[PDB]
Subunit: 148 residues, 12 copies
Amino acid sequence: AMSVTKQLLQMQADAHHLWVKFHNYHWNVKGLQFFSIHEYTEKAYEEMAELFDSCAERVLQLGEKAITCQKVLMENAKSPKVAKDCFTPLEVIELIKQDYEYLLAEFKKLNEAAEKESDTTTAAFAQENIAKYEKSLWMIGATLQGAC
Amino acid sequence: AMSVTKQLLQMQADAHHLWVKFHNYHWNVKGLQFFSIHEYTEKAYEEMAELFDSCAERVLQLGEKAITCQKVLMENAKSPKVAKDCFTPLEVIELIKQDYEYLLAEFKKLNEAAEKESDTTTAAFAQENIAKYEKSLWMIGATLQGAC
Amino acid sequence: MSVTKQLLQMQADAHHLWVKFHNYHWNVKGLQFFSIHEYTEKAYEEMAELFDSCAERVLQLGEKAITCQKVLMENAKSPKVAKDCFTPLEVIELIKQDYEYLLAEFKKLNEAAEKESDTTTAAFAQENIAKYEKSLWMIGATLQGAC
Amino acid sequence: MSVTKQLLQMQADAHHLWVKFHNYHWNVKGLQFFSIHEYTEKAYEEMAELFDSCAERVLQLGEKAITCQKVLMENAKSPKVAKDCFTPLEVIELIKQDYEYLLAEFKKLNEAAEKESDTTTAAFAQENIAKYEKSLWMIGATLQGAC
Amino acid sequence: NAMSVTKQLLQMQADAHHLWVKFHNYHWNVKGLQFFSIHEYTEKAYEEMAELFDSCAERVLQLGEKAITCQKVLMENAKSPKVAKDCFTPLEVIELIKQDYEYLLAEFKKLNEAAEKESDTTTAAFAQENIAKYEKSLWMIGATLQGAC
Amino acid sequence: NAMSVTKQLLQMQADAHHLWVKFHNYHWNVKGLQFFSIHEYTEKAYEEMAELFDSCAERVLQLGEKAITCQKVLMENAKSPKVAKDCFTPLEVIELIKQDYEYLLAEFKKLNEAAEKESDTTTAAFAQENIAKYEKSLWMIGATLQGAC
Amino acid sequence: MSVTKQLLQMQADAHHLWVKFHNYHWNVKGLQFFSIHEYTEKAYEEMAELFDSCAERVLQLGEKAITCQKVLMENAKSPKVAKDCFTPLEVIELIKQDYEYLLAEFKKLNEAAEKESDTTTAAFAQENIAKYEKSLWMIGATLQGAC
Amino acid sequence: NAMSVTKQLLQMQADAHHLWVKFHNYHWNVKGLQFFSIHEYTEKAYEEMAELFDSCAERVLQLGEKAITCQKVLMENAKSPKVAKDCFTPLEVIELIKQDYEYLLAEFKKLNEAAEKESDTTTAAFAQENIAKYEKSLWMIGATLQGAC
Amino acid sequence: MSVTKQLLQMQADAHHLWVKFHNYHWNVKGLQFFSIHEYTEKAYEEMAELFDSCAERVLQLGEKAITCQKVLMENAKSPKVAKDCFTPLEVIELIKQDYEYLLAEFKKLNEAAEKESDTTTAAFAQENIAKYEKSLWMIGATLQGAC
Amino acid sequence: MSVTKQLLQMQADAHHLWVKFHNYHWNVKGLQFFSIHEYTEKAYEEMAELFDSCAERVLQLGEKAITCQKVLMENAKSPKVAKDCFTPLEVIELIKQDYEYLLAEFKKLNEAAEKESDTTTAAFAQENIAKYEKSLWMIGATLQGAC
Amino acid sequence: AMSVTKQLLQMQADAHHLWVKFHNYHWNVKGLQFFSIHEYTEKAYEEMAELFDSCAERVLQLGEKAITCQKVLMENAKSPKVAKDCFTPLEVIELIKQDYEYLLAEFKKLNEAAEKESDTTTAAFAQENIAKYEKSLWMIGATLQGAC
Amino acid sequence: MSVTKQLLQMQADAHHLWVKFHNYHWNVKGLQFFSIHEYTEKAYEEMAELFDSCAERVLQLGEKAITCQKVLMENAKSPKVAKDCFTPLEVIELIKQDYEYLLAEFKKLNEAAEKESDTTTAAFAQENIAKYEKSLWMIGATLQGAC
Ligand SMILES: [Zn+2]
Ligand SMILES: [Zn+2]
Ligand SMILES: [Zn+2]
Ligand SMILES: [Zn+2]
Ligand SMILES: [Zn+2]
Ligand SMILES: [Zn+2]
Ligand SMILES: [Zn+2]
Ligand SMILES: [Zn+2]
Ligand SMILES: [Zn+2]
Ligand SMILES: [Zn+2]
Ligand SMILES: [Zn+2]
Ligand SMILES: [Zn+2]
Ligand SMILES: [Zn+2]
Ligand SMILES: [Zn+2]
Ligand SMILES: [Zn+2]
Ligand SMILES: [Zn+2]
Ligand SMILES: [Zn+2]
Ligand SMILES: [Zn+2]
Ligand SMILES: [Zn+2]
Ligand SMILES: [Zn+2]
Ligand SMILES: [Zn+2]
Ligand SMILES: [Zn+2]
Ligand SMILES: [Zn+2]
Ligand SMILES: [Zn+2]
Ligand SMILES: [Zn+2]
Ligand SMILES: [Zn+2]
Ligand SMILES: [Zn+2]
Ligand SMILES: [Zn+2]
Ligand SMILES: [Zn+2]
Ligand SMILES: [Zn+2]
Ligand SMILES: [Zn+2]
Ligand SMILES: [Zn+2]
Ligand SMILES: [Zn+2]
Ligand SMILES: [Zn+2]
Ligand SMILES: [Zn+2]
Ligand SMILES: [Zn+2]
Ligand SMILES: [Zn+2]
Ligand SMILES: [Zn+2]
Ligand SMILES: [Zn+2]
Ligand SMILES: [Zn+2]
Ligand SMILES: [Zn+2]
Ligand SMILES: [Zn+2]
Ligand SMILES: [Zn+2]
Ligand SMILES: [Zn+2]
Ligand SMILES: [Zn+2]
Ligand SMILES: [Zn+2]
Ligand SMILES: [Zn+2]
Ligand SMILES: [Zn+2]
Ligand SMILES: [Zn+2]
Ligand SMILES: [Zn+2]
Ligand SMILES: [Zn+2]
Ligand SMILES: [Zn+2]
Ligand SMILES: [Zn+2]
Ligand SMILES: [Zn+2]
Ligand SMILES: [Zn+2]
Ligand SMILES: [Zn+2]
Ligand SMILES: [Zn+2]
Ligand SMILES: [Zn+2]
Ligand SMILES: [Zn+2]
Ligand SMILES: [Zn+2]
Ligand SMILES: [Zn+2]
Ligand SMILES: [Zn+2]
Ligand SMILES: [Zn+2]
Ligand SMILES: [Zn+2]
Ligand SMILES: [Zn+2]
Ligand SMILES: [Zn+2]
Ligand SMILES: [Zn+2]
Ligand SMILES: [Zn+2]
Ligand SMILES: [Zn+2]
Ligand SMILES: [Zn+2]
Ligand SMILES: [Zn+2]
Ligand SMILES: [Zn+2]
Ligand SMILES: [Zn+2]
Ligand SMILES: [Zn+2]
Ligand SMILES: [Zn+2]
Ligand SMILES: [Zn+2]
Ligand SMILES: [Zn+2]
Ligand SMILES: [Zn+2]
């Protein structure tokens, strides 16, 4: 049963990490599409705050402790690190693709762990997010591609 | 009197055709402006569904039969054919310009036929659409142009 | 068969029902004309949405949606109707058969999705199974006479 | 008649139909009572708007609207109804005849307006011509049996 | 000896119709600086008369008698004040509406007394709701017409 | 000699519960072309019964007696018409609802008379509001069932 | 029990909780009266929705819902409450026990649904399992003392 | 021999003003864990008192007497309970508001009796609407103060 | 003259009235200050919209809109006012003359549009003709004294 | 006065104006009755908000608000009104004098706040200074005759 | 005291000027971002109409006369003049940057004049606008920049 | 110190409080669990907004916002809490200390802003000073016992 709460706790830390990272994209993008990227990443960091809270509260429902220490959040984060603080629009979209691919893989890991424990609530939460990101990733991939 | 219902029936088939075609643009556009083109063509195919229904129902009001067979719709369609299934944003906008120019010419044909029959209801329907497309085509032309 | 093959079948069927549901909408006759006209309007709107959802899922899955109307026509397998004038009870009976067809296809889609471990497509199929099971209950009752 | 004479005729008729549509609204009996009650309520509200619009167009054109109910009574020419009890089908048949009358009167108004180059009245006539042609289609389909 | 609830409602039906027509006269034909506010006020007023007409008719039908369906009968039965004018200043309209509302109020009081003698709680509540409405409106209209000390 | 307001409200509580259950039977089990409109009408109806149940209970509590909290007592005390059917045509449902509403109306009139003898203005207003509601509804239901001349 | 037997059990129980939650709603006393009154009102509205949903799922599955209140009374198995007066804490403790009962019953419904490959009922069970697991967490925290 | 409707309304005007001021005292000066919910409840309450003040004044004016316009007269005429406190626990506020509402309720009952003797349906309806409001509120406030069996 | 020439004239006039209508809005004095201030606010907002619509129609028609304020000033031909303090009745009388001017220009635009078979510009002119005919009726009545 | 002494003065005055504005609201007579009735209603609602805001700012600053109506009566210094019947123009003239009084008191509050480096009270003063300067302009224009 | 009303009157004339100029951008931009620039400049000219009215009405509150003559508005305008009537999207954004920089400098001039007169109402109006334009100018500058 | 240095300090503090306010939100125990949970949700949402506003002001001022969580952690100076279980009164007492800290920092920001003649940052600081002065009043009263 610890594997479900272990994976929720991993996601809590990654959600925090992406919330910080998505602010970086939001502030520091430059170029003609500044405003739409700014608005896009604003919605995205809001989703990461919500995801942060949901993972924590699911852990609590499952009888464990959520992470409450900045230091632990920082140490446990495993989503892609970025060294930049200035971006083109296409660079942000490419970075987000990578961040969403990481989230997608981690949600499928959560689903499996939920499956082994017969945890339908956590499985439903995982799968709603899998659907959300497979849809976004299709759109992001099309945004990065050139036409034949 | 058959010329008004003949032209409404032509438009019914073209509206169906453009509804299918506009999905093609909606799905298969690639590049940075993916999302706005996707949203734009979504509104456009909704207008073509509405146009499909309006033409059919006007024919019925005029005492004739709307087309109800896929095969007849396909055979009767005369709006521009496209062979592609992958597009740049500028390519979609250029294709839509051509589709809207075709609609505009066909609505003016409908207006004339309505005029000869003193059909004020069909004439009003034609003219509301002429105004709509002359306005859109101005915007689309500006979108495709370079500045002096 | 496969998730993408089944999605493409449903895309073609959604287009066919979108067209047929307009025939019911336009051509029903009788005292319940307006309620039937309104009902079929909402139904065709759902068929348009289904058409789009099926295509986009195929695209998300790395395959091409159908974009040619001739292919849509050739591939559709939902019930054919060679009438263009209906009573309200005839429309309801036809919609029942159309919804029985969709429900069976959604169940095939779910099976295919569970085999492929595709939770997203499975969730899509299951939401539709629930929608049609409920709607078919009400349609059945509409067509019955009491005990 | 000239545009104003025709507007004044339509003012009288809108008043007459407003009264009559209340008769349908109150006095229909049978399973579809509530839908007819609701439809006829919308219809009389439309007749009240029509009455005001005709009158105010007359005032815009420099003439006096009808203000005496006795004149309104004497000038009305829309179909007379003797009954005070109806089936839903009878009401729909009577509304069709009322709407046919209005539609023909709006066409007379339009011709009159066109001759006087009165674009405002013409646009008002044509907007209503469109409204009644659409309704009359639906009403016709409602009274039909399927073939 | 006064007429029953149903005959009072029938009278009220005929008057509401008459006032609906009459209020259009004020709506169309007022002249002067306050044209628009009088036009809007009288539009709300005729809409209330249309509603009253339908309410009285439907209450008569609920009580088992038939509503009036003929415009000749509506015209002959109306007893609300007539006006032989088709042009008005704003003060004239306000004065005339005061007379119309005083008339309505008096008739709603008769309606209430009839409803009470018949133990008709539904019609009594209907009458009293309206009595409250015109007592308030008449206070405001009276203040609009008065001169300050 | 008739029972007090509080005992009448307690009866009304039990009936509202019974009709809430019964209206679900009509909601679920009507069959025929008008299935959906009957399904929706009866859904609005049971929601009104749920509200009535809570209102009567809370008024009894305001008057210092205790509401019924046991389903066995609710079942034993209900006096509204029973139906031994679980399948209905649309006309059957309309006919049966007419009988249920005529029952309610008669009980709300008793409630009003009891409230008046007790000078209970709150309960009287509550009863009369409901009397007005069912008199209107019963007029429409009766018209729905009649045949035109 | 099979899916329908289990749905019918939950129909009876939803009815029972609807009644009981009114008892909490009316009869709580103490400083938090109004918030408990409001919370329990939302809770009984949820029980009324649950009652209708179970019944209609049964009808969809081809069986008859419970229509006799005597059957509803006899089949209910959720916790019995003898009292008719409560403190806010007592109400919260009693609701926790009611919600634990429901949560266990929804899990039985889900297992039953999964065995019958009934995705619609399964989704309905799991949606409620999620709802009660979340509520029960909050309720538990509400009854606790801090460490 | 009891005072007329108009003098009762004038009393009610003065009290509503007093309670409007007093309810601010509870609003500002409550202390303790339930500070915010008491602050909000008493804000809704003073807003109701402001409305009552205006309603009573306007009804007096409709009845042809003049409303009170001087704050010295408002202060001298108020008879609702005074409180010589400017700090409160939540339970104290609830207890004090119970006393204020019991006072209002008793005065609205006198208002109703006066309105009935005068056949003043408008004021009677106004009084009874308010009687219904405080009977419900007082039930809830009483439950908030009680201890469970 | 031509549709585009007439549109450009109206563009210049819309700008002029937009400015003048602010003068009425700011500088009216007297008891009806606020209603006049609100009325003229809505009116200048319509002038801004008219300015934009006229320019964009010229652009749709392949010609250049006016973009220089000196050209706008030189070309405006609506009534000049050399006052900056007004009574409410003076504002209404001036607005009447401004609206009579606009109505005549809209009629010229319609004629030009019908000659050019330009249904879009004609519809634009006719919607405005109807708006101003109605508004001038009400303004006239505002300025009259009763019989 | 210090900031709190000045806030307490404004608390008393807001109470006084709340009462007075009801007098204007009830007792105005003449053609503009309804607009004055509506304007003064908004005005007293503003005075009630002002009364609460001053009191709560005092509480924030560590002092006690006024709770006794006798103190409120004795401390009020806004213009005394003896009348209980008014023309619309008289009401507007009296409101101008009330608003001038408030505006001067808000300026005193601002100076006091600035001296104490109290940004919160200062911002509150200045927001109201802006409000009354704008209103007083409109009120002035309303009382004027045009030149 | 004349320096506050002098500066409000300068701003009234510039607001009028920018309202005309912003229509020029709105109509005459060409290129892929036509529609968003069109929408952006539409909001901007609405703000300039509002600014025009606010400056005028503040002058009137201060006991002076607003400008009511087109000719005076034209003569007094000092915001940047543009000679073009056709623009790329980036050209419009660059021109707006310059127009907003001018507004920002003029609002700070207004604030100072308000300060010297203790005019808190005009100072508040100035400062609300300073905040608005410093925020917009940050966004506009990022839109024009390239990433490091 | 400087405006940008103070803004960066507050950015780090906003992040720290955002995290801590979630601890209160999750881990409070007792009868007021839900109101405290809702209160702290709104509070953390304000901390997220504050984080963003502080960063964007620094960027507007030509400097870089903090984008590394290690820097955020190192720089935060708001009160540390080494508990993860709370009563409702403990949460309120901690929030009081957190809000006292923010208020003092906002006052330093205002001073720095006025020195730099930065009206925009000063307005930001002052709106927050007013918000926290009011909220601390209410929190204080929540923690008191009456006289
Ligand atoms: Zn932003
Ligand atoms: Zn944003
Ligand atoms: Zn957001
Ligand atoms: Zn949370
Ligand atoms: Zn830590
Ligand atoms: Zn491709
Ligand atoms: Zn999409
Ligand atoms: Zn979309
Ligand atoms: Zn859409
Ligand atoms: Zn259709
Ligand atoms: Zn076919
Ligand atoms: Zn060019
Ligand atoms: Zn349709
Ligand atoms: Zn429709
Ligand atoms: Zn639709
Ligand atoms: Zn799509
Ligand atoms: Zn093809
Ligand atoms: Zn059966
Ligand atoms: Zn009705
Ligand atoms: Zn209705
Ligand atoms: Zn209606
Ligand atoms: Zn009208
Ligand atoms: Zn007459
Ligand atoms: Zn046929
Ligand atoms: Zn009108
Ligand atoms: Zn109107
Ligand atoms: Zn209206
Ligand atoms: Zn009716
Ligand atoms: Zn007749
Ligand atoms: Zn007179
Ligand atoms: Zn008598
Ligand atoms: Zn007097
Ligand atoms: Zn249902
Ligand atoms: Zn339903
Ligand atoms: Zn419902
Ligand atoms: Zn309740
Ligand atoms: Zn029991
Ligand atoms: Zn029968
Ligand atoms: Zn008896
Ligand atoms: Zn009959
Ligand atoms: Zn309640
Ligand atoms: Zn409630
Ligand atoms: Zn509810
Ligand atoms: Zn149901
Ligand atoms: Zn039974
Ligand atoms: Zn603990
Ligand atoms: Zn407050
Ligand atoms: Zn509050
Ligand atoms: Zn409030
Ligand atoms: Zn009032
Ligand atoms: Zn005094
Ligand atoms: Zn005590
Ligand atoms: Zn007595
Ligand atoms: Zn007890
Ligand atoms: Zn203004
Ligand atoms: Zn305005
Ligand atoms: Zn506006
Ligand atoms: Zn534009
Ligand atoms: Zn120029
Ligand atoms: Zn005249
Ligand atoms: Zn009032
Ligand atoms: Zn009012
Ligand atoms: Zn208000
Ligand atoms: Zn307050
Ligand atoms: Zn005192
Ligand atoms: Zn002057
Ligand atoms: Zn545009
Ligand atoms: Zn736009
Ligand atoms: Zn806009
Ligand atoms: Zn203005
Ligand atoms: Zn000039
Ligand atoms: Zn850079
Ligand atoms: Zn939560
Ligand atoms: Zn929450
Ligand atoms: Zn939130
Ligand atoms: Zn941001
Ligand atoms: Zn880092
Ligand atoms: Zn104390």
